[PDB]
Symmetry: C6
Subunit: 82 residues, 6 copies
């Protein structure tokens, strides 16, 4: 049960990422995190395969809207989230 | 391709309220809400038909431009079963 | 029943605007909004005439304290506020 | 011209607490509170007589300057019926 | 010199979650939590033995560097009676 | 019963200051304050002597981690805090 995240500059690029990820595979949206400097992180949860597929599609879709600052998959054993 | 989310991201809140007003008066769109992400950035979100949403965002963006900076303008067509599920809310 | 707003860089310029607007005409102070980057929006509600008079006086008074970033009147039919 | 609001806006919180202390010890002014607006900006607000408020803000600004940056210093004379009504509180 | 606090401060949240994961898998350290201070800065805090904490922070910092910027890496040895008392929590 | 504070750029430098202050003298940690721009203020309370000793040690320790923006002691008569 992996965690996946797309970090963007702008919220529009983050919602675009969230839409692309959930349509792409069997992943559940955990939520959003605002850390300032116009930075928003979109977090998904699901099996490793579904998470890797979702983040690649979420990053590719956000890229067309705004600047993607980070794309990452953590195949974890939600304790690690804020 | 029937249901959609629309957004106008501005630098300044006045430009965002101006966008929200122009959107709802220009097309058959319902205001979902606002989001503050820091750096003076505010996102205005609307919901309605893809055609209505594309028309609202173009009018929202044009009206906000007269007040402040518009940083982003975007339309996301949605499945219609859980249109608002992808929003932070 | 119009909405009026003065957006400033600095809070002192915003409180100065709020004071000038409420003394100028029959307008009710809705509140303040902080959006970061030192930006503060002062919002008033009242009839269109009273709102246009208040915002012109609020902008002119704030100008003497700090930098006014936006001045606007919306003659609306509070649903549109955050 | 009898009741007034006073403010000292600083870059840094230490300079703001230093201003608040200098204000209350220098003149017959009551501390209303603080406001954080981002960009490291903090506003200290005082209430009292116009004369006392002008004297407190000058001492608050001078004391804060030794600690940090002072971005704004201002006095607003108020009607006395609803002195604090204009504040965000 | 037995109990310690460790921290990795990053620009970006993804780099912070990556640090948190690398820390807990690399050494016998417990994740305390996160702190957002603005400017896109996030601090990840761990608790454990001084040796384990120095090993976790080095692995957390190295793993975060592959994702984003690491702004600070630090180890604070603690008395063991009230290890977490100094944290903002 | 004085107030003492160390203002830093970064949270790590602030926690380092808090640790150095509490070990240095008989001072109680009031708390932390985040004002944005990566600025964090660490506040202590105790007798004037203990507070002056704590802030000097807290500033010296933070200096080795990050940039200290302010160091100050107020020998007060907690009303003055946010």
């Amino acid at each position: 049960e992996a965690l996946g995240m797309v970090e963007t500059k702008g919220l529009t690029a983050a919602i675009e990422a969230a839409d692309a990820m959930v349509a792409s595979a069997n992943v559940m949206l955990v939520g959003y995190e605002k850390i300032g400097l116009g930075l928003v992180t979109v977090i998904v949860r699901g099996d490793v395969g579904a998470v890797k597929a979702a983040t690649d599609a979420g990053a590719a879709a956000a890229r067309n809207v705004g600047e993607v600052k980070a794309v990452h998959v953590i195949p974890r054993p939600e304790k690690i989230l804020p």
